[PDB]
Write an enzyme that holds these catalytic residues in place. Structure first.
Site, PDB file in Angstrom:
ATOM      1  N   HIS A  40       0.837  -1.198   0.000  1.00 51.33           N
ATOM      2  CA  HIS A  40       0.000   0.000   0.000  1.00 51.33           C
ATOM      3  C   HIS A  40       0.879   1.257   0.000  1.00 51.33           C
ATOM      4  O   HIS A  40       0.300   2.329  -0.146  1.00 51.33           O
ATOM      5  CB  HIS A  40      -0.996  -0.034   1.132  1.00 51.33           C
ATOM      6  CG  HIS A  40      -0.558   0.394   2.486  1.00 51.33           C
ATOM      7  ND1 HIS A  40      -0.247  -0.557   3.472  1.00 51.33           N
ATOM      8  CD2 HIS A  40      -0.400   1.586   3.082  1.00 51.33           C
ATOM      9  CE1 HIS A  40       0.080   0.079   4.580  1.00 51.33           C
ATOM     10  NE2 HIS A  40       0.011   1.379   4.367  1.00 51.33           N
ATOM     11  N   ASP A  84       0.032  -7.607   1.614  1.00 46.38           N
ATOM     12  CA  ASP A  84       0.538  -6.229   1.672  1.00 46.38           C
ATOM     13  C   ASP A  84       2.057  -6.233   1.755  1.00 46.38           C
ATOM     14  O   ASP A  84       2.637  -5.989   2.833  1.00 46.38           O
ATOM     15  CB  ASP A  84      -0.090  -5.478   2.849  1.00 46.38           C
ATOM     16  CG  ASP A  84       0.107  -3.971   2.805  1.00 46.38           C
ATOM     17  OD1 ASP A  84       0.595  -3.559   1.708  1.00 46.38           O
ATOM     18  OD2 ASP A  84      -0.235  -3.291   3.797  1.00 46.38           O
ATOM     19  N   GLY A 175       2.240   6.438   8.499  1.00 41.01           N
ATOM     20  CA  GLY A 175       3.607   6.893   8.376  1.00 41.01           C
ATOM     21  C   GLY A 175       4.619   5.835   8.758  1.00 41.01           C
ATOM     22  O   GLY A 175       5.756   5.867   8.287  1.00 41.01           O
ATOM     23  N   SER A 177       3.848   2.682   8.080  1.00 45.42           N
ATOM     24  CA  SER A 177       3.526   1.692   7.080  1.00 45.42           C
ATOM     25  C   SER A 177       4.717   1.199   6.302  1.00 45.42           C
ATOM     26  O   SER A 177       5.520   2.058   5.893  1.00 45.42           O
ATOM     27  CB  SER A 177       2.613   2.336   6.023  1.00 45.42           C
ATOM     28  OG  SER A 177       1.309   2.509   6.502  1.00 45.42           O
ATOM     29  N   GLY A 178       4.925  -0.053   6.020  1.00 44.41           N
ATOM     30  CA  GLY A 178       5.997  -0.624   5.297  1.00 44.41           C
ATOM     31  C   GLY A 178       7.257  -0.944   6.130  1.00 44.41           C
ATOM     32  O   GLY A 178       8.057  -1.659   5.575  1.00 44.41           O
TER      33      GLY A 178
HETATM   34  N1  LIG Z   1      -0.996  -0.358  13.953  1.00 50.67           N
HETATM   35  C1  LIG Z   1      -2.029   0.626  13.567  1.00 50.67           C
HETATM   36  N2  LIG Z   1      -3.049   0.829  14.328  1.00 50.67           N
HETATM   37  C2  LIG Z   1      -1.889   1.120  12.129  1.00 50.67           C
HETATM   38  C3  LIG Z   1      -3.015   1.595  11.449  1.00 50.67           C
HETATM   39  C4  LIG Z   1      -2.845   2.080  10.145  1.00 50.67           C
HETATM   40  C5  LIG Z   1      -1.588   2.090   9.537  1.00 50.67           C
HETATM   41  C6  LIG Z   1      -1.447   2.591   8.087  1.00 50.67           C
HETATM   42  N3  LIG Z   1      -2.263   1.698   7.276  1.00 50.67           N
HETATM   43  C7  LIG Z   1      -3.456   2.117   6.784  1.00 50.67           C
HETATM   44  O1  LIG Z   1      -3.952   3.211   6.980  1.00 50.67           O
HETATM   45  C8  LIG Z   1      -4.157   1.079   5.907  1.00 50.67           C
HETATM   46  C9  LIG Z   1      -4.082   1.555   4.421  1.00 50.67           C
HETATM   47  C10 LIG Z   1      -5.492   1.198   3.870  1.00 50.67           C
HETATM   48  C11 LIG Z   1      -6.383   1.733   5.002  1.00 50.67           C
HETATM   49  N4  LIG Z   1      -5.603   1.233   6.124  1.00 50.67           N
HETATM   50  C12 LIG Z   1      -6.102   1.162   7.379  1.00 50.67           C
HETATM   51  O2  LIG Z   1      -5.373   0.753   8.289  1.00 50.67           O
HETATM   52  C13 LIG Z   1      -7.555   1.319   7.756  1.00 50.67           C
HETATM   53  N5  LIG Z   1      -7.667   2.040   9.055  1.00 50.67           N
HETATM   54  C14 LIG Z   1      -9.100   2.369   9.358  1.00 50.67           C
HETATM   55  C15 LIG Z   1      -9.940   1.062   9.234  1.00 50.67           C
HETATM   56  C16 LIG Z   1     -11.364   1.211   9.807  1.00 50.67           C
HETATM   57  C17 LIG Z   1     -11.265   1.753  11.270  1.00 50.67           C
HETATM   58  C18 LIG Z   1     -10.623   3.176  11.231  1.00 50.67           C
HETATM   59  C19 LIG Z   1      -9.168   3.090  10.729  1.00 50.67           C
HETATM   60  C20 LIG Z   1      -0.465   1.614  10.221  1.00 50.67           C
HETATM   61  C21 LIG Z   1      -0.628   1.124  11.527  1.00 50.67           C
END
Ligand SMILES: N=C(N)c1ccc(CNC(=O)[C@@H]2CCCN2C(=O)CNC2CCCCC2)cc1
Ligand SMILES: [Ca+2]
Length: 223
Positions: A40, A84, A175, A177-178
């Site tokens: 992503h 992912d 941020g 992510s990855g």
């Molecule tokens: N460990 C965590 N809580 C976490 C959460 C998010 C991320 C970054 N990843 C993301 O944002 C990925 C990309 C596609 C949508 N997605 C999401 O994680 C979706 N987050 C929402 C889902 C429904 C509930 C509200 C939050 C990285 C870490």
């Protein structure tokens, strides 16, 4: 990283920042020419930044290398975030040193309760936004299958695991992510998703790297 700590400069030497005129994702160096990140995190125009601590100051030890190839898993699903994972080939090999070093791929999957190191330059707040200049770290255990699926029913595939803290306050975030989840010196996870950040009963979800070791090696060997 929410609820974490300042790592210390170059204490996570395999941690990379993916840059497009700003930091947008993390990654992990797995040899001098290849990085593992989240599908992503795909985009055009990726610059890989190795050796980083303060991402907003040229401090010394940085290596900036353009991506030559970004290989998103062919079975990646952007809706479920199954598979992912993305491999990035550097245009030139990095110079490996104490501050820029590769992390080992696992030989076996990690078990529930295993403590791991999660790091990045993602958001440090659970309700709002604050992005750090220096790399942040979090120690976090892998959760059991049942607890993961109870937290996120019908959303957890065999290619995902949960890690973190059900009580809230400590997690990865946007941020990050990855970026790496490293357990006993092996790259077991990739920061992938979650519901919010550091919320009660909503731990982080990570790409289960042990399921992709052969895919990674085969793909690198053919590129
Ligand atoms: N460990 C965590 N809580 C976490 C959460 C998010 C991320 C970054 N990843 C993301 O944002 C990925 C990309 C596609 C949508 N997605 C999401 O994680 C979706 N987050 C929402 C889902 C429904 C509930 C509200 C939050 C990285 C870490
Ligand atoms: Ca820097």
């Amino acid at each position: 990283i929410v609820g974490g700590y300042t790592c210390g400069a170059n204490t996570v030497p395999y941690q990379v920042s993916l840059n497009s005129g700003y930091h947008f994702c993390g990654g992990s160096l797995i040899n001098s020419q290849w990085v593992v990140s989240a599908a992503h995190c795909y985009k055009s125009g990726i610059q890989v930044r190795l050796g980083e601590d303060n991402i907003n100051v040229v401090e010394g030890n940085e290596q900036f290398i353009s991506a030559s190839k970004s290989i998103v898993h062919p079975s990646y699903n952007s809706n479920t975030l199954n598979n992912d994972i993305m491999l990035i080939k550097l245009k030139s090999a990095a110079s490996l040193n104490s501050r820029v070093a590769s992390i080992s791929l696992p030989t076996s999957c990690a078990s529930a309760g295993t403590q791991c190191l999660i790091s990045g330059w993602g958001n440090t707040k659970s309700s709002g936004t604050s992005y750090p200049d220096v790399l942040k770290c979090l120690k976090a255990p892998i959760l059991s299958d049942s607890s993961c699926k109870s937290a996120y029913p019908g959303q957890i595939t065999s290619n995902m695991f949960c890690a973190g803290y059900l009580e809230g306050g400590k997690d990865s975030c946007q941020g990050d992510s990855g970026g790496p989840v490293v357990c006993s010196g092996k790259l077991q996870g990739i920061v992938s998703w979650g519901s919010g950040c550091a919320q009660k009963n909503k731990p982080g979800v990570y790409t289960k790297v042990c399921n992709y070791v052969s895919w990674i090696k085969q793909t690198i060997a053919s590129n």
